[PDB]
Amino acid sequence: GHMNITDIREQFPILHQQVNGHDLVYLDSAATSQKPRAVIETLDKYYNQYNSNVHRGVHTLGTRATDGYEGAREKVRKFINAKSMAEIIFTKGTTTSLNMVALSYARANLKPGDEVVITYMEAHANIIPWQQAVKATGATLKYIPLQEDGTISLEDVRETVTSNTKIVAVSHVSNVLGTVNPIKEMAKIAHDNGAVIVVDGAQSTPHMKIDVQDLDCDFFALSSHKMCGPTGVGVLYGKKALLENMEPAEFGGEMIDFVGLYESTWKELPWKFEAGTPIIAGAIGLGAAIDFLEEIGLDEISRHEHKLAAYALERFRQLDGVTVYGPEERAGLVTFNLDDVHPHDVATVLDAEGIAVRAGHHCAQPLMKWLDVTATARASFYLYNTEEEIDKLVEALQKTKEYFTNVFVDLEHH
Amino acid sequence: GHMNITDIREQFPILHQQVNGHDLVYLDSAATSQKPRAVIETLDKYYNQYNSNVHRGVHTLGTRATDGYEGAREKVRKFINAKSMAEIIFTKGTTTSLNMVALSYARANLKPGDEVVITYMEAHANIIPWQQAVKATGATLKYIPLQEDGTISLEDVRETVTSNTKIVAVSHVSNVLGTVNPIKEMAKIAHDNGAVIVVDGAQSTPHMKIDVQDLDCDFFALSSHKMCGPTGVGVLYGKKALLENMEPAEFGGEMIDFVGLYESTWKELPWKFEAGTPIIAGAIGLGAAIDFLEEIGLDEISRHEHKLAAYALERFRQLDGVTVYGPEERAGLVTFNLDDVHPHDVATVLDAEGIAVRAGHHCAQPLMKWLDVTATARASFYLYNTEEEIDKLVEALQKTKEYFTNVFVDLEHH
Ligand SMILES: Cc1ncc(COP(=O)(O)O)c(CNc2co[nH]c2=O)c1O
Ligand SMILES: Cc1ncc(COP(=O)(O)O)c(CNc2co[nH]c2=O)c1O
């Protein structure tokens, strides 16, 4: 109970506005999160006081910028409990990190007969890179089936992963079902079969503590914009032994050692995988966001979101004609559908009430077809959301149902 | 004479500080530029008022964020005089744009016997991607020789580019020599031989007007951090007909149309080449930087930098034992070396005087070996730099020479 939601909301200026005459109710944090004053003012101080190119150590502003950038790297390492800063690569997001794994590891380690194993609930960022990799290498793509409640059975994992499996790619938390996957046990299974494991942690990292040494994940991808950090920056973590043997996905300055006319040698880790001028301000702001979240406490955020999710599930079960997808035990989000109402109209009406939710396929079309739906609505929570906002959401959903029912009965009257 | 340098400097808060007790003299804009209040406050307003994920059009903040992002795209299109927004791809920088060209165009259009033609003055971002592409395709890499003053002869271009040349990759302006290359004539030559042309415009775009239709460049890469914009964002321009036939370099959400279990289809341009959540705030800030530069006028900035460069060249010629590299007609930078003093010590002493210059190889090792030097110093100018700062630079260089000469004569005395 260490968490004061009023004091937390006071740090996010964007929450204190009205939309369509109604107080803003932002329930779309799984799409992107909002930023506290700490992060915005960190970007401000960088651009106002010590912006310069990094990795030169020549003048004072350059030294300060380099110190900020590499200190943010160390902050990330501590945040996910990685062994070394050499295992922390700054990218532009989760998607780019997964693409780097698929390019530099998969396409170099896949032979005909090899298997890449994913799940039906994966977002598109954790699907199409593997599709392209197996198409380029002539390998085989396989899918772990899902249970009736949208969870993954460990026996299904043991059945799908075989001696020919080299890569198992799975999300830590589903951005649609809210499912928390058994990443540690799946990693043990993949290693038992001689495969590596690649964890999509875009949805888990902002909301729960990450320990890559306890997870024993071989790769782990995360996105800054979902965890109160700036846009356009993310992290690829990989075990140092694996990253040492992988060739770079991008080539250019800053990642080189010697450059001949036709041949070149690369820098050591992690700079081998960071070509060109890096995302300096964004990485420093991600470090600031990590400081913010850690001072609040990721366990506290997790418990707050558990309370929010249980409350939301109970209040959704109080609504007639509403279908919620996923398991009971879940992260802080609810994907649903109103009977007789397309989710786009639901979210339009909700925005008219000032409530921001997402409508569509949520970048998971195979999962949508597994759910036998064309689209869904989704309300997602974070550390600044309250139970009163969920009350507003469910009241607006009831009003939406009533409104569309009575629009139906008047046009039938005609 | 429309340019008031005092009013311009008033917009950059980072310039108004002291380093080591001396007023800051920032002459390292070729490494990275500083930002005006317009850009920083644009980022501030985004994160404070309408941050949300884009390309959904579902709630109001999302619509505002999408409008800002795509409006920044249109601003870029107008800025470089591209025909269509479909030809404007947001990347994380020039290096990534050139790597995308090398991955999606070069590696798909190079056969054994084909030629990729570059120059000795290219930065590493415009060298190593082509090295890797020709190594992957078994093609051949060739270099256009340079004149005695660091310029490129059009006859040397016609000699190097042949009927087997498919790609000519060249920088618009050298970040070391200050040379402005004849990009339009080289494009005509490359097209005459059946090749496309890829322009590295990282150093030209911030300081001179770009017209890709007059240049007739097939690809053009630029970086936001060098043109008063945020870090971690850049642009790849490509002719629409070429981009339509190129496969994506990255795969994931937002760039897809249909996603099956094993096959996928891509979005139309430009979103085909933008996977995952884009660099929303950075792109909007780049649009703000474009607004700033265009209200000042790129021709005015170019003339101011021409005045600065002529003044700096004359004052450098007044110094004994100083070697300047490159031609007389040049962009706004001076790369040089002090006799008997390593450039790292030069730049250390200069930072002790509050002057920020760069020392090293400037990501151009083949050029350094062509210059028969191991490292150089470089002072680069932008719209906020004055002639008084160049006076401070040359006075500090004279003081540095005297200091090292008399440190030499006292240790010889011993
Ligand atoms: C589980 C998961 N993986 C990967 C990604 C992609 O991350 P990015 O590269 O930073 O974009 C997302 C973002 N998912 C969503 C973005 O918008 N709505 C969403 O549900 C995600 O939720
Ligand atoms: C001509 C040229 N091309 C490409 C690049 C790479 O751009 P980036 O991807 O945004 O990093 C640079 C940056 N050149 C320099 C960066 O620092 N010092 C420099 O001289 C450049 O000057």
UniProtKB/Swiss-Prot annotation, chains A, B:
<dbReference type="GO" id="GO:0031071">
    <property type="term" value="F:cysteine desulfurase activity"/>
</dbReference>
<keyword id="KW-0663">Pyridoxal phosphate</keyword>
<dbReference type="InterPro" id="IPR010970">
    <property type="entry name" value="Cys_dSase_SufS"/>
</dbReference>
<keyword id="KW-0808">Transferase</keyword>
<feature type="modified residue" description="N6-(pyridoxal phosphate)lysine">
    <location>
        <position position="226"/>
    </location>
</feature>
<comment type="subunit">
    <text>Homodimer. Interacts with SufU; this interaction induces an opening of the active site pocket of SufS. Interacts with frataxin/Fra.</text>
</comment>
<dbReference type="Pfam" id="PF00266">
    <property type="entry name" value="Aminotran_5"/>
</dbReference>
<dbReference type="InterPro" id="IPR020578">
    <property type="entry name" value="Aminotrans_V_PyrdxlP_BS"/>
</dbReference>
<dbReference type="InterPro" id="IPR000192">
    <property type="entry name" value="Aminotrans_V_dom"/>
</dbReference>
<dbReference type="GO" id="GO:0030170">
    <property type="term" value="F:pyridoxal phosphate binding"/>
</dbReference>
<protein>
    <recommendedName>
        <fullName>Cysteine desulfurase SufS</fullName>
        <ecNumber>2.8.1.7</ecNumber>
    </recommendedName>
</protein>
<comment type="similarity">
    <text>Belongs to the class-V pyridoxal-phosphate-dependent aminotransferase family. Csd subfamily.</text>
</comment>
<feature type="active site" description="Cysteine persulfide intermediate">
    <location>
        <position position="363"/>
    </location>
</feature>
<dbReference type="InterPro" id="IPR015424">
    <property type="entry name" value="PyrdxlP-dep_Trfase"/>
</dbReference>
<dbReference type="InterPro" id="IPR015421">
    <property type="entry name" value="PyrdxlP-dep_Trfase_major"/>
</dbReference>
<dbReference type="InterPro" id="IPR015422">
    <property type="entry name" value="PyrdxlP-dep_Trfase_small"/>
</dbReference>
<dbReference type="GO" id="GO:0006534">
    <property type="term" value="P:cysteine metabolic process"/>
</dbReference>
<comment type="function">
    <text>Type II cysteine desulfurase that acts as the initial step in the SUF-like Fe-S cluster assembly pathway. Catalyzes the removal of elemental sulfur atoms from L-cysteine by using the cofactor pyridoxal 5'-phosphate (PLP), resulting in the production of L-alanine and persulfide. Activity is stimulated by SufU, which acts as a sulfurtransferase that receives sulfur from SufS via a zinc-ligand swapping mechanism and transfers it to SufB.</text>
</comment>
<dbReference type="InterPro" id="IPR016454">
    <property type="entry name" value="Cysteine_dSase"/>
</dbReference>
